[PDB]
RNA sequence: AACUUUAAAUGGGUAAGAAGCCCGGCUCGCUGGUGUGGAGCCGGGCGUGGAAUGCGAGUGCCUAGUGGGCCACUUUUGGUA
RNA sequence: CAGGGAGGACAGAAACCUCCCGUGGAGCAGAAGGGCAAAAGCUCGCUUGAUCUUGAUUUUCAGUACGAAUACAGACCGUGA
RNA sequence: GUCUACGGCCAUACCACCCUGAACGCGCCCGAUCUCGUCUGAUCUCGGAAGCUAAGCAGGGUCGGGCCUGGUUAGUACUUGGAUGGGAGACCGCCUGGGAAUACCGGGUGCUGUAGGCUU
RNA sequence: CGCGGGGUGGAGCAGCCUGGUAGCUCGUCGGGCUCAUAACCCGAAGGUCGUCGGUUCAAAUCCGGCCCCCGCAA
């Protein structure tokens, strides 16, 4: 049976990238975090205090409590057929904003921009995203050159 | 029309005595450096034990001192009188420094005394140029550049015009 | 021979440090304990006082950290002192005090806090601290950025600190690094600190050069003779400068005359000229070889 | 003595090289991977042969040793001892295991380091011989006799490369002519147009 | 396999609105150059219900039996098997 | 720092001094992995935050304990400007 | 155009050699009385301005290395799902989708935030 | 191939765990004693600790892979 250590099997996951060792960049330390910000978790091996557990690596949660040097994040963990909404205290070095949420917050702006605009013009502008539709009928121009013929090459033993 | 701060100066003259033994043998040679340099030298301790010499790890085996300014100018002038103003080709280093070893301290002009004894010592001259203090300052440390360096040939010829000392092979 | 150290594999595995660390200007280990702010403040500006002692100038700035880079909200230079009656001696301990006082009073003028938190007007060099007045806007507080300078007793970086505290800034400090602090018995003398603030330590040296030899006095001090600054009135001169700083600490920018828009620099040579150099190098080497045979 | 090669044939487990973990390994039988007139230049041996494997299987060091002698035994009789150069391109690094018994049975059954074996894939060259162009059917015949020492089937192919180099024989004489290749004894050195111009002058003077 | 500069496919989190945005204002003993910052309270205005497809969902008690498994494609450990 | 080169009476392959290169190839109490260069490594100065007391969370988990740890809060401190 | 102070990203920024730097600036530099610390004012600290771009530093160049970014390798290796496909096996072929990395060959060689100068 | 154990002046030995100084019995050699041998007396040498590597400030000492011998496992 395997051991039950906190950092068992974390040889590559908590390791630093190639030629990215040394001093932690200082823009992480001076990035703000509010309540309810969608946040993804990625462990860092330089700072050993406040490391999240290996089950929270790559996961994404939301912030509920903000302390001096760390934030509390509500995360979802699958424990044998059920999902537990648990709370962890993770230091700031391990924390980035999740860029999955901003696309919805981006899109809402143009939905609201195109709702107040063109309402006085009456033009119904489509707002729902649509999946990639089948392409419409079009004409392909073969002006000049005829479509050249392709031949299956004869086999030759490369090795 | 060479630049006035490309003139070759003397940065430091380093003296060292390695008797290879602590106790009364070492502390008497320190007073030799005291009465010659005019300053208290600093003892030099062993890196690790060698049982052949009778020394141990971190055992006091040497004494050394570094002299700056006009006093290093005077002591170097005193030292080459012992070596009658001559040096070998191999004594000069590739970085522009040189040095030599004299047989004993009585040839400088200091009278022997029975309470201390007789001691040999070692000379080494670290030449320099105005602007060599960049590489060892705390604030804005940096290299000196290839043009500003002192080559071995440039250090050998500086000894030729200044002290008129010939360099013969040996 | 022996193996070459800086081979192809050396630069392939080489990680460079930060640009400011390579230039030796920032002390990022201390900067982490510095201006960055606790996460429960949510962009509350953490102000720090940057004091840099340069060979011919003294720079005193107040900044707070931002994600685009920390922003200077107020700055004061030692070369502004000729306006305030200090022609020369722009890099001593007394000049650092006036530079710090000029930064202190200028910041309070731009925030509307000129009349409140006057600070020390009759400087003695004691342990003064600014206290916030109830029913009034709170006193400005900041911290010192020593940088890479060695903070021993009597450093000029703490001279600008004393000028800032006496100007009405609540900077946490202890009177251990100020000059006049006796090391052996662990006590602080305000009169000795006053002399260094009043520039009287320079006054003793100039008078010392009177008795020893006149030739070294003219070599060590030249603009003191040229601007007629004898040791007698520097205590009056700095008191005149202290009063002149507090009455008008505002700064007026120099007008910007139209630039000729010329390039003193060497422009970067393009690829076509780079490719033309080797074609001319190879062609000339061939014809010069042809003359040998 | 040792087990038959039928058991240790297929690529069963992970690669198990000799290291700190796998210690006490006896030395492999094959030690001389190159023979013939190996101290030869590139311009006299243009023709290169091959023995290309056809199965994803493992070749033991003894089979490589046995086929090396048989290829050399015929080649010496044909063109002498210095008209060729044989290259064994498989180095046995995978250590095989033996569960040596003498009761325990399968209690703690982990293998001892019996010997070494070399993994080979389909389309991989086992042995290559460079020689002169006229002596061509000798290479096929010498490699045909070495096929019987190896398990499975494998094919003999005449390379398009100039000897043991990685450049085509038809293009090889061209790159020497305007100085794109420099013969470095047994091999050749490729010189691009990317280095400093001082070495370009040395090649042209 | 107990090496790695690179590096897939498969896979694992999060988001795709009404509990969302945009305003105006109070409270704080929290933080203070500065109604600074944050949080909580209210009041007001915005519905084209803001990807596809499918399906009524949520929730509380009592609770038997089970806790010897085996086989099959692919991956893989030990063993010659 | 490990290491390498060059020099200097004893002194040599190495005892001690000096210069240059040196992304860590040294060291961190230890086996291994991760991490660390104005440091987490080496040397000094001062000290006992290895002190007292509520809670919350993570880790094995049944999501129970013990142990370990993580962010806090109230004190009393140490250290440093 | 450019510099200084504090920075953000942290080699397109580094490394090796060479060339040019008007003005300010940064520095080299001159000394140890005071503050301070060393064997030594070499370092640090303190007090200055005779000389200077020699160096640091800025810029540019090398069919430069490195680094960054593309093509090629290559629809290759590999891989989701499928077959009463082949083969004694080892393995291979086909359908359905996805899709790499060396060698080799091209291009580039720091942007930028705040404050304060200089070229007036 | 497995575990417990040893190898050291010429024959046998001590000294290790708690490393700072290698001792002793017999034996070899030289001289004396006797006409000569023996016995006895005087004097001196002989110990890389099996090999490699690490450690500690230093290795016979502490540790790991390997050669021989005694008897053991099947």
């Amino acid at each position: 049976t395997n051991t039950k250590g906190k950092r068992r099997g974390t040889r590559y996951m908590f390791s630093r990238p190639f030629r990215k060792h040394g001093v932690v960049p200082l823009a992480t330390y001076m990035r703000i975090y509010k309540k309810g910000d969608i946040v993804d978790i990625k462990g860092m091996g330089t700072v050993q205090k406040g490391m999240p557990h290996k089950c929270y690596h790559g996961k994404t949660g939301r912030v509920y409590n903000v302390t001096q040097h760390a934030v509390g994040i509500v995360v979802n963990k699958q424990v044998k057929g059920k999902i537990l909404a648990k709370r962890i205290n993770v230091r700031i070095e391990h924390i980035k904003h999740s860029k999955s949420r901003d696309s919805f917050l981006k899109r809402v702006k143009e939905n609201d921009q195109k709702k107040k605009e063109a309402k006085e013009k009456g033009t119904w502008v489509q707002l729902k995203r649509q999946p990639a539709p089948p392409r419409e009928a079009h004409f392909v121009r073969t002006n000049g050159k005829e479509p050249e013929l392709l031949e299956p090459i004869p086999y030759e033993f490369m090795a | 029309k060479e630049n006035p701060m490309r003139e070759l100066r003397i940065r430091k003259l380093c003296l060292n005595i390695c008797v290879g033994e602590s106790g009364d043998r070492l502390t008497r040679a320190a007073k030799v450096l005291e009465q010659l340099t005019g300053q208290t030298p600093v003892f030099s301790k062993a890196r690790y034990t060698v049982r052949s010499f009778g020394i141990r790890r971190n055992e006091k085996i040497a004494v050394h001192c570094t002299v700056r300014g006009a006093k290093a100018e005077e002591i170097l002038e005193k030292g080459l009188k012992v070596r009658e103003y001559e040096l070998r080709k191999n004594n000069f280093s590739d970085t522009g420094n040189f040095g030599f070893g004299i047989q004993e301290h009585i040839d400088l002009g200091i009278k022997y005394d029975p309470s201390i004894g007789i001691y040999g010592l070692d000379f080494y001259v670290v030449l320099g140029r105005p602007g060599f203090s960049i590489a060892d300052k705390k604030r804005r440390t940096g290299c000196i550049g290839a043009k500003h360096r002192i080559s071995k040939e440039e250090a050998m010829r500086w000894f030729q015009q200044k002290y008129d000392g010939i360099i013969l092979p040996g | 021979f022996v193996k070459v150290v800086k081979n192809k594999a050396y630069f392939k595995r080489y990680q460079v440090k930060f640009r400011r660390r390579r230039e030796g200007k920032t002390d990022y280990y201390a900067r982490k304990r510095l201006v960055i702010q606790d996460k429960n403040k949510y962009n509350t500006p953490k102000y720090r006082m940057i004091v840099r002692v340069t060979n011919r100038d003294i720079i005193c700035q107040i900044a707070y950290a931002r994600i685009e880079g920390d922003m200077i909200v107020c700055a004061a230079y030692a070369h502004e002192l000729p306006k305030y009656g200090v022609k020369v001696g722009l890099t001593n301990y007394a000049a650092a005090y006036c530079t710090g006082l000029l930064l202190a009073r200028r910041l309070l003028n731009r925030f509307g806090m000129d009349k409140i938190y006057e600070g020390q007007v009759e400087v003695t060099g004691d342990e003064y601290n600014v206290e916030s007045i109830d029913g009034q806007p709170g006193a400005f507080t900041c911290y010192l950025d020593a940088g890479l300078a060695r903070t021993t007793t009597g450093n000029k970086v703490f001279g600008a600190l004393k000028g800032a505290v006496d100007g009405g800034l609540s900077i946490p400090h202890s009177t251990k690094r100020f000059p006049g602090y006796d090391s052996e018995s662990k006590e602080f003398n305000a009169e000795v600190h006053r002399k260094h603030i009043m520039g009287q330590n320079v006054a003793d040296y100039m008078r010392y050069l009177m008795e020893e030899d006149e030739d070294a006095y003219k070599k060590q001090f030249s603009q003191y003779i040229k601007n007629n600054v004898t040791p007698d009135m520097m205590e009056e001169m700095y008191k005149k400068a202290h009063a002149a700083i507090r009455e008008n600490p505002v700064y007026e920018k120099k007008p910007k005359r139209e630039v000729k828009k010329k390039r003193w620099n060497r422009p970067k040579m393009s690829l076509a000229q780079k490719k033309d150099r080797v074609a001319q190098k190879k062609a000339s080497f061939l014809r010069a070889q042809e003359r040998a045979a | 003595g040792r087990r038959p090669a039928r058991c240790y044939r297929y690529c069963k487990n992970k690669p198990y090289p000799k290291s700190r973990f796998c210690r006490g390994v006896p030395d492999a039988k094959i030690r001389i991977f190159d023979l013939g007139r190996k101290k030869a230049k590139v311009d006299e041996f243009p023709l290169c042969g091959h023995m290309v494997s056809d199965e994803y299987e493992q070749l033991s060091s003894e089979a490589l040793e046995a086929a090396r002698i048989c290829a050399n035994k015929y080649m010496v009789k044909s063109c002498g001892k210095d008209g060729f150069h044989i290259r064994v391109r498989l180095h046995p690094f995978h250590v095989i295991r033996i569960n040596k018994m003498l009761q325990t049975g399968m209690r703690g059954a982990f293998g001892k380091p019996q010997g070494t074996v070399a993994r080979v894939h389909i389309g991989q060259v086992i042995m290559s011989i460079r020689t002169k162009l006229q002596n061509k059917e000798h290479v096929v015949e010498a490699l045909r006799r070495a096929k019987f020492k190896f398990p499975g089937r494998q094919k003999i192919h005449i390379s398009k490369k100039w000897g043991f180099t990685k450049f085509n024989a038809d293009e090889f004489e061209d790159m020497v002519a305007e100085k794109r290749l420099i013969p470095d004894g047994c091999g050749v050195k490729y010189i691009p147009n990317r280095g400093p111009l001082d070495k370009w002058r040395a090649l042209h003077s």
Side-chain angles (χ1 to χ4, degrees):
Chain A
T1 73
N2 304 322
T3 76
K4 293 187 300 294
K6 310 275 183 63
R7 302 186 54 176
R8 191 251 307 179
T10 53
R11 176 167 182 165
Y12 303 117
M13 182 179 72
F14 278 152
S15 71
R16 293 300 304 161
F18 180 56
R19 300 194 292 111
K20 289 210 169 307
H21 301 258
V23 192
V24 179
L26 287 198
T28 309
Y29 290 124
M30 65 182 179
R31 198 151 312 164
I32 62 170
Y33 296 106
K34 301 290 179 67
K35 268 191 57 181
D37 291 331
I38 312 299
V39 159
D40 62 358
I41 308 176
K42 173 168 177 170
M44 185 179 288
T46 61
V47 183
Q48 289 87 45
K49 300 188 69 184
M51 294 183 286
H53 196 254
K54 49 188 182 302
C55 51
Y56 312 116
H57 192 99
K59 307 302 186 306
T60 303
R62 50 153 281 261
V63 190
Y64 81 105
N65 171 70
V66 180
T67 50
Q68 284 82 239
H69 308 96
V71 296
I73 298 169
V74 179
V75 298
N76 298 303
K77 182 184 179 196
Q78 184 178 2
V79 193
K80 293 197 286 185
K82 63 190 182 309
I83 319 302
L84 309 186
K86 44 205 302 197
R87 295 180 182 178
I88 45 176
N89 312 317
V90 181
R91 213 165 260 264
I92 303 302
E93 294 83 3
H94 296 285
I95 296 302
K96 312 179 307 183
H97 294 269
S98 161
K99 287 200 304 304
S100 63
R101 183 66 178 191
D102 63 358
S103 75
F104 167 65
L105 277 296
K106 184 264 289 181
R107 188 158 49 80
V108 160
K109 305 306 171 189
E110 293 83 3
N111 296 115
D112 287 307
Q113 188 274 331
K114 301 189 297 300
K115 215 172 298 180
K116 64 90 176 179
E117 192 268 320
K119 186 199 291 180
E120 65 271 11
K121 304 154 62 67
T123 63
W124 181 65
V125 188
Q126 175 54 252
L127 308 181
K128 298 176 174 280
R129 299 169 302 161
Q130 292 305 113
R135 47 185 164 268
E136 293 83 3
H138 58 86
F139 287 83
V140 172
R141 311 191 62 237
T142 177
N143 47 357
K145 64 90 176 179
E146 190 276 331
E148 69 275 16
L149 183 63
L150 296 195
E151 294 293 328
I153 62 170
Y155 168 76
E156 190 276 331
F157 191 29
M158 294 299 291
Chain B
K1 61 181 292 294
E2 202 188 317
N3 190 281
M5 294 183 286
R6 296 211 46 186
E7 289 320 294
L8 197 147
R9 63 165 65 243
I10 297 178
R11 265 210 309 170
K12 64 178 176 299
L13 167 71
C14 311
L15 319 184
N16 45 314
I17 306 181
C18 198
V19 293
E21 177 51 64
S22 50
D24 186 74
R25 274 293 297 161
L26 183 137
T27 178
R28 291 173 307 161
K31 288 178 281 295
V32 177
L33 286 177
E34 159 65 39
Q35 63 84 30
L36 177 63
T37 61
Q39 59 185 328
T40 68
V42 171
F43 299 151
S44 173
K45 47 176 58 58
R47 300 209 306 273
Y48 64 92
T49 303
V50 177
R51 283 182 178 266
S52 170
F53 313 133
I55 69 175
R56 283 196 295 279
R57 154 71 66 93
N58 190 359
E59 183 174 359
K60 199 167 296 306
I61 59 168
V63 55
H64 85 292
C65 167
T66 65
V67 180
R68 322 305 199 105
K71 181 55 70 66
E73 179 63 75
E74 203 269 335
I75 295 182
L76 176 57
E77 190 45 64
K78 272 178 152 286
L80 288 175
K81 179 65 69 66
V82 176
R83 285 305 170 193
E84 61 200 58
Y85 305 94
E86 64 183 2
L87 283 175
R88 318 176 280 194
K89 292 280 300 308
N90 63 7
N91 298 331
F92 279 82
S93 80
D94 62 358
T95 51
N97 310 300
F98 66 99
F100 57 95
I102 64 170
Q103 69 276 17
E104 51 195 41
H105 75 292
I106 201 173
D107 310 292
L108 278 298
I110 297 89
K111 174 63 183 68
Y112 163 78
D113 62 357
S115 308
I116 284 174
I118 185 65
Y119 285 112
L121 61 83
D122 175 37
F123 269 26
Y124 209 82
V125 166
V126 189
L127 295 171
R129 214 187 289 264
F132 268 25
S133 179
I134 289 172
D136 48 11
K137 66 180 181 176
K138 167 68 171 303
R139 182 203 161 82
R140 280 279 304 274
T141 311
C143 300
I144 57 183
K147 289 301 197 64
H148 182 74
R149 286 206 285 269
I150 302 173
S151 85
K152 183 188 185 297
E153 289 303 305
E154 194 160 53
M156 293 177 70
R157 60 173 301 277
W158 172 88
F159 176 61
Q160 296 294 321
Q161 290 64 66
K162 185 74 171 306
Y163 291 165
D164 291 331
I166 57 169
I167 299 163
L168 59 87
Chain C
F1 323 102
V2 297
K3 209 163 195 181
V4 189
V5 176
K6 309 174 75 179
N7 54 2
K8 251 191 190 182
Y10 181 71
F11 299 105
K12 273 183 157 304
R13 299 300 286 221
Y14 197 76
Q15 156 164 30
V16 301
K17 297 205 277 198
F18 293 158
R19 177 171 57 81
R20 303 299 302 281
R21 180 59 193 89
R22 289 196 268 99
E23 301 163 318
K25 300 178 186 178
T26 311
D27 193 35
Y28 283 109
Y29 179 79
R31 188 177 214 269
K32 178 191 168 297
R33 319 292 167 88
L34 264 173
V35 69
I36 65 168
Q37 178 79 288
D38 303 299
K39 297 285 102 175
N40 47 8
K41 302 293 185 52
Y42 311 93
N43 292 127
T44 289
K46 188 159 199 173
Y47 296 107
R48 83 184 202 269
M49 183 177 177
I50 309 163
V51 175
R52 299 298 180 247
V53 182
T54 300
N55 268 348
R56 305 203 171 87
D57 202 75
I58 285 167
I59 304 175
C60 286
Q61 311 151 300
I62 289 173
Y64 64 98
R66 269 300 168 275
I67 200 164
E68 289 82 41
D70 49 355
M71 293 177 70
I72 309 298
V73 64
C74 191
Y77 290 93
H79 58 76
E80 312 171 303
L81 277 296
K83 178 183 174 182
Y84 292 97
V86 184
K87 299 289 94 176
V88 293
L90 262 55
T91 175
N92 48 57
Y93 191 82
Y97 187 84
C98 293
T99 313
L101 176 59
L102 184 54
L103 181 67
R105 298 304 310 167
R106 185 173 300 170
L107 175 78
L108 264 64
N109 196 13
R110 293 154 66 163
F111 281 165
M113 326 179 63
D114 205 291
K115 303 288 105 175
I116 300 93
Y117 309 117
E118 289 296 307
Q120 292 271 69
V121 180
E122 300 296 322
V123 187
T124 308
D126 62 358
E127 311 95 295
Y128 177 68
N129 297 274
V130 184
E131 299 192 312
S132 296
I133 304 175
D134 294 331
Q136 286 293 274
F140 191 89
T141 176
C142 57
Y143 316 116
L144 196 143
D145 197 302
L148 292 174
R150 162 74 268 185
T151 52
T152 44
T153 306
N155 197 2
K156 275 185 282 285
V157 193
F158 300 96
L161 161 70
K162 196 55 194 164
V165 175
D166 302 330
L169 279 72
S170 164
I171 311 178
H173 65 85
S174 160
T175 65
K176 192 183 189 185
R177 300 279 80 81
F178 286 152
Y181 169 73
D182 180 65
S183 167
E184 48 263 23
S185 296
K186 280 82 179 172
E187 93 272 12
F188 184 43
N189 294 114
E191 198 45 65
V192 188
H193 194 202
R194 182 183 183 277
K195 296 309 175 183
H196 285 88
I197 283 167
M198 284 333 287
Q200 297 306 113
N201 59 305
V202 193
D204 288 318
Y205 188 32
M206 294 177 71
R207 291 169 184 161
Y208 170 64
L209 280 174
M210 295 298 102
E211 288 93 51
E212 184 170 41
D213 55 333
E214 284 309 302
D215 46 354
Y217 166 67
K218 309 158 191 177
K219 183 253 297 174
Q220 166 67 53
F221 306 119
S222 182
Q223 268 59 52
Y224 282 164
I225 309 178
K226 173 183 184 297
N227 288 279
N228 318 299
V229 188
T230 61
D232 313 285
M233 72 291 291
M234 294 183 286
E235 212 171 315
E236 291 311 300
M237 182 179 72
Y238 288 134
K239 282 181 189 172
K240 255 71 171 175
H242 288 168
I245 281 168
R246 301 172 92 91
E247 56 90 20
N248 185 68
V250 75
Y251 183 68
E252 175 166 50
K253 307 193 69 184
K254 305 177 183 180
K256 175 59 74 180
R257 211 265 290 171
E258 186 43 67
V259 189
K260 315 289 179 177
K261 193 63 181 175
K262 61 159 300 178
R263 180 190 181 82
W264 301 95
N265 199 3
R266 205 184 193 277
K268 183 166 285 184
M269 182 179 72
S270 86
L271 177 60
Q273 303 160 300
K274 284 197 284 294
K275 207 173 295 299
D276 186 49
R277 180 187 297 202
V278 298
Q280 299 170 303
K281 274 179 178 173
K282 284 188 290 187
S284 185
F285 175 72
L286 283 175
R287 53 183 299 115
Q289 181 176 51
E290 205 55 59
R291 306 285 83 79
Chain D
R2 83 176 187 90
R3 280 192 167 165
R6 292 188 296 272
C7 312
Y8 309 128
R9 172 168 183 174
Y10 300 145
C11 283
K12 191 65 63 67
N13 315 296
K14 290 179 202 313
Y16 194 48
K18 172 163 195 156
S19 60
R20 167 180 62 251
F21 297 100
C22 174
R23 59 179 167 278
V25 184
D27 179 50
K29 286 286 289 183
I30 190 167
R31 297 299 305 274
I32 319 169
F33 295 104
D34 300 327
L35 55 90
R37 205 183 70 180
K38 44 175 181 304
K39 197 177 299 177
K41 310 308 170 187
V42 296
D43 63 358
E44 72 272 16
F45 291 154
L47 173 73
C48 174
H50 286 316
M51 171 163 29
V52 180
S53 162
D54 271 359
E55 294 94 4
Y56 178 44
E57 61 86 20
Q58 310 175 312
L59 290 185
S60 69
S61 56
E62 293 179 353
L64 298 159
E65 176 54 62
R68 173 170 75 80
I69 296 180
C70 190
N72 194 14
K73 198 63 62 68
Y74 181 76
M75 187 66 204
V76 161
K77 296 177 183 173
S78 171
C79 315
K81 60 100 178 177
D82 52 353
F84 67 101
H85 171 209
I86 306 189
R87 207 95 177 263
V88 178
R89 313 203 62 188
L90 289 183
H91 299 252
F93 293 138
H94 198 319
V95 189
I96 210 68
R97 295 202 289 274
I98 187 66
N99 196 15
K100 184 189 169 179
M101 294 299 291
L102 301 174
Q103 54 90 30
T104 65
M106 311 282 324
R107 182 186 307 278
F110 193 73
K112 300 287 98 175
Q114 185 146 47
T116 73
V117 65
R119 319 274 293 275
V120 72
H121 321 316
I122 308 174
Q124 205 179 323
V125 171
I126 301 159
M127 185 180 288
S128 53
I129 302 173
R130 56 183 276 259
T131 177
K132 293 185 184 293
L133 190 149
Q134 53 276 61
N135 296 277
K136 158 179 162 180
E137 61 86 20
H138 310 265
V139 191
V140 184
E141 190 44 62
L143 289 161
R144 207 265 314 175
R145 291 199 166 190
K147 284 202 305 175
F148 297 96
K149 301 304 168 178
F150 282 136
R153 63 181 293 165
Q154 69 275 17
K155 279 192 285 294
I156 306 171
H157 174 258
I158 286 177
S159 180
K160 309 199 60 52
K161 301 311 191 168
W162 183 276
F164 287 170
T165 70
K166 56 177 186 191
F167 312 95
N168 309 305
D170 61 57
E171 182 65 26
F172 194 78
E173 69 275 16
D174 291 331
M175 299 156 102
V176 177
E178 68 275 16
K179 294 194 171 179
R180 294 298 312 277
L181 294 176
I182 293 300
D184 194 49
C186 183
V188 74
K189 263 182 294 196
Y190 169 76
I191 291 177
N193 290 318
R194 199 172 296 171
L197 207 46
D198 63 358
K199 73 165 187 180
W200 179 90
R201 297 161 187 169
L203 267 298
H204 285 271
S205 56

